[model samples]
Target: GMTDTEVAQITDNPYKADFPILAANPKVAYLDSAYTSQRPRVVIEAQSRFYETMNASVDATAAIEDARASIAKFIGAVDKNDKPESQQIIFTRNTSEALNLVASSLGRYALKPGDDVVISIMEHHSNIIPWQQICKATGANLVYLRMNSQYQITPEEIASKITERAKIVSVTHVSNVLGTRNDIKAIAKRTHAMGAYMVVDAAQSAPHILVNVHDLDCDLLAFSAHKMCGPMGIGVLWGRAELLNAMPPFLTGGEMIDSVTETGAVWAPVPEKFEAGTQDAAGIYATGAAIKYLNGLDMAKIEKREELLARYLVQQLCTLDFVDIVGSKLGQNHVGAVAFNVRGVHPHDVSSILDMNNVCIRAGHHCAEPLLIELHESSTCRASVAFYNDKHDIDQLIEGLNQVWKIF
Candidate 1:
């Protein structure tokens, strides 16, 4: 149990009890929300509610439509008048599938030979590989916009690389490894001015902040529900209705088809055209509960708490002379996670030591191998915080790190 002071230091609503994993393992200090967040009881119960009552019925269809509305509102996938952009919310297995769907389907139809697809080096493999594969198929050139020493992508770089030849620009809203928050709205503006479409990998940003796709004006966006305290194996792909309507279906057969002739099959409408086969109705129901759970606490408050926690975590890490913090320095824009390495100690070794002390963290290149290569680092340790995390978690992490230093 966290002390009142410790809980106060982290968030007004710690929400520890709402998560069984945290409650069951009281000794563990989980700092790996970036990889996947722990879900609240409400989200779990929502799935149960589905299995008990809503499963295999017309009610399931209604539940899915309701979930779509919830997700659309969550991501600000709304028209200028604040109506739900339900037709544009296409469900996928995860962010990876969503990205691949866009990369393959959109790339196949919209791109041409000698065209360029721009991306940042800080992108995760999910965002990178799809574009790489798509470019290969389309004969489009894959271009990378390099990040600075601080692992920050600047507007100047966005302007320089998203040239007239660029047909598609893909970038992460936040660097999963570096904790650098990109200015996606500004980047989108630049890409639009260049007559190119902007695709955002919102896997990192969607969990920690309020993402308004309309406000961002991105052509397409992808994020996983698991990162936002929802169930795994469910993700969202949000795109402009016109763009989604125009693109060919990524998957074929089953629910995605409108009609089939002897010659060829016509695809379904916008969202269903993208959604093939049986959907994860239970997970979608749980996602709706997750959205409601988040809304109950208010996203602005959650964002504020996480930002403060990030600053505190960064400040504490900086106190250790051996620590080499990556991404934004103090007083810069950052979210929940901070990546760093201890001098003379491998990241895996550091993580092992921390784990022994019941402090859970992520240690690796974090799927941003290109960015790690650019930074001349093979791997790094990441401490990601959520609203449930408190000062005690950070203290435990710092103490475990000190023990690692002594051992090494």
Candidate 2:
């Protein structure tokens, strides 16, 4: 999606200098941002600033409310007139909690026996188990949309799998393990034709790429703030107002209720019904700061820059006969992650050696066993990049792997 001139402009990442932890510990080549990103000074300051200056009860802090509105705008959860609807954005504990809310509140009521809840093999356990258990409880079947050898769910796969029996369809925007991107828009088009509700697990997509939920046109979307330079405790769920309003509350307590007697009570509006208990006000505030920080940068440029980094990463790994990439060999196919194995060596051992030399990467199943099984791999090593990462990081990663080879 980038032009030749735009691609040419991407040199060593200018954004890396903005991150505090990466700047302080210059030796640590943090190739693990797909797990969680390092926060910048603005986000860090805004986080402490919440409790420092505007400490209060969760009800009416202007910062939290403003943050909600901004996030709603950022994700394009808007009305027909294009104005943001703040109530559509629910402040949740994490992406796991967000998906759980959808599964328990919506899927629990909608699905029944003989129906199918379609998800992909690429989902994180957070997205899989909730639906898996829900299907079990409701006597519905759990169907998976299988991918091709290139780690893609082809259009034919969608036609065959997402049938009229699909009560719900959940998918990941970007894979945590394979680092592959899914065309949620294309899938949503098919999912909508079947009259099934589409849920997007954007835990990997939102941090680095531009995700306009309005354009995505999915019923609900979920992501975490920590993956985008915000505080860890905050997650977000954006849904269509009507669907959110119709669903029952996932949790219940003080602010979520209107008037409570000894037995019965009326619920509040859409967002209030979903959000119960005192909110983590600071985390919400920090997420707003994170959104602001991302908004300041060019998301289009970031994607291209990441593509270049991923290309270099994949290219370097390809030259090593000992390394076997888990997904597509093309860097153009990957987003910010690339999972691989150091031939015959255990990933844990490889990761430990890499860490000692200041090359940080993730090793294991990456919490995606079903997907790994599809590749016939039990576990693997993953080096993920962010817009902030540079060629030097990959250089270190490759060099570290070479050292790992010697030890092995």
Candidate 3:
């Protein structure tokens, strides 16, 4: 007889039915959402409808702005009218590009030879490399706040790292490999105390958590639509009005031009001024539909569902004696992405075995080479979860791993 909690965990995921790929492929268990998420049927149809109806008109331009407003409200940047202040949002290719726009524009202006930029050691390549290049160019020193034994960047570490010499502090709200949820509000508070700009990478957090920009109080935030329920080719960069106004454009093109003299040419407003080239209008329209789908599911319930899935995945992995888990042991503050390796077996072998069983997982350094080296692990197997995953997926992964142990 199963316990009440065990039975509850086995319930078929309520949101799984809406995704076409998952519906069509019942045998495949996708556990790599931390890399990129699966899209829903509505998001795909909405994108298709845009090309089918309004592909060749000025309506694409207006539709892109409408999607931006929905994203702004989704992140809790609403005004008295229960909508967002429009100019604060700018669309980019993805979170990587959004981070680049900030580093190239703001880092070029604010960073100097004597200043310092602080970030955690757990940042992904997108977050880490941008600061590295910017610091190298500006002659600024890049500082890092390393994690403790608990895989947490504590307040004491934050206070010690962020000083008057620090010019910028950028960090991820949730780690993609470690499954650790950071306290961004506290980090932002400390960064502001030192008169530095705070930036947040919500690529992992935005999907599983309710990310409120106003509550985070960050100067700038970035996230990819593909990581959420939205489509590829479009992401968002949300910033404070004053900072965005002060910064210049990252790329120059005709779309962002306001006036043209023979000389430099005047740029447009803050949001549009940052947008260069013809935007992905179809993808933008589909992103709006993605937000609508997530809204229908209610983020509060989504958050709770993902939390339980993460814990359940962790709990199941802990029982395997051959598994060497890398991140959180108890799964208390972790939401998704569990990194581990089988004893005496390479990660590629483990992933291959899982794939043979129709269980999908990622194998490699996860693009966080420095963090992996710090953890003394050259490579690892990362299994991530989303709202659509259930106990069955975890069971498939565990069963696949048992086969790997036998092979080794």
Candidate 4:
């Protein structure tokens, strides 16, 4: 008999049946994992079990810690011995909140007028707006690095934008709009050499890639759990322990405080200081189940599988003379999703036609209007792939898009 772990890894995809949404909607082609992933049954049961068996306030703490450990291991925030370091992971509502925490706290004290805060023009609004607000409040200058013809942030661009005056450099690990993966490790090296802090927005990359924050050597990294088969309203912010300790708290409330006087308050240490109020213990426990589910499948295998699907998606879309892909060619830096457009039709029309065929895809700015403006496009159609998706879904998407052309 195979061991439980080995048995769990059935040949192709025995785990696909764990997702109830896919089971219930048999005809639907869900290609929007970039937005949020469908949760497995185990993750759902874990949340219910938390409420049913251990709903007490004290019991929730144990479950929360277990979930934190799982997250620590998932992101490779381990000690030299490869043991999980849960203290380095702080739970937030989503990636936006995590990024805002760093932007709000770090920018408050470290930034000043004439200091440069470097970012790429390809950032989503969540990453872009936080820095914009930080610069506006502190009178700091925001420097943008433009992309190359292939929609990639090259090393030459990073070197030019991140000058000696740079105080902070924030960029996305993978772009939600372009599906282009930035060289964050290389970027971090350049940023650190200039004596600047590096922050990464890994919202899009975390679900599809194996992220080791230690290897990236970034000062801070943020991602959302919902995008990685976990629950919504649960996010992660991982930072170097010393840097987190040095920064002040982002939100202040019940659990985060150590002592409070009439006019003074001393906050708790590290992660607790950043996590305030009553957290969603149920969500955290369920997120641990999500991590376990992904672990059983192995992220490396998942990345390889998804990359092949993405390449096929790109190749198929390229065959159509009317389709215009936004980024590099197939099998390049693309992963998870692909953004494209039909020459004459608006994105909304394309999406609606696909909807009629029960082929789900995203359209419009995708929370990246600035990037769309840079591409000289008002909007574009997007089809994102997930581990659960197969070639059938891609075929349906192509068929749907052909129908869209016929109707237009």
TM-scores of the candidates are 0.96, 0.96, 0.97, 0.96
What's model 2's overall lDDT?
A: 0.89
User: Relative to the unseen true structure, what is the C-alpha lDDT of residue 260 in candidate 3, on a scale of 0 to 100?
Assistant: 79
What's the lDDT for all of these models?
0.88, 0.89, 0.90, 0.88
* Candidate 3 or 1, higher lDDT: 3
Cα RMSDs of all predictions?
2.5, 2.1, 1.5, 4.3
- Cα lDDT tens digits, model 2, 1-408, are 435564454445688888988887889899998898889999999888877877875443777788998899888776888777888899999999999999998887689798889999999999999998888889989999999988999999999999999889999999998888999999999999998999999999988678899788899999999998888899999998889888888899889998999999899987889889999988898899888888888677777688788887888899898999999998788887899999899999999999899999999989899998888998899999888888788889999999999999
Best prediction by TM-score: 3
What TM-score does candidate 2 get on C-alpha atoms?
A: 0.96
In model 2, how large is the Cα lDDT of residue 165?
Answer: 92
Greater-TM-score candidate between 3 and 4: 3
lDDT of 1 by residue, 1-408 (tens): 324654466744367888999988878999999999998999999999999987898889888998899899999987778888888899999999999999988898789999999999989999999998989888999999887666677777887888999999999998888778888999899898988899999999999988999789899999999999999999999999889988888988899887998899988898999888898999999999999999998999888778777876887788898888877767245687798899879999999999889999999988888888888888889999888887677878999999999999
> How many residue pairs clash in model 4?
0
Instruction: Enumerate clash totals for all models, in the order shown.
Output: 0, 0, 0, 0
Ten-residue region with minimum lDDT total, candidate 2:
1-10
Clashing pairs for model 2 are none
- The TM-score of candidate 4 is 0.96
State the displacement of the C-alpha of residue 302, model 3, in Å, after optimal TM-score superposition: 0.8
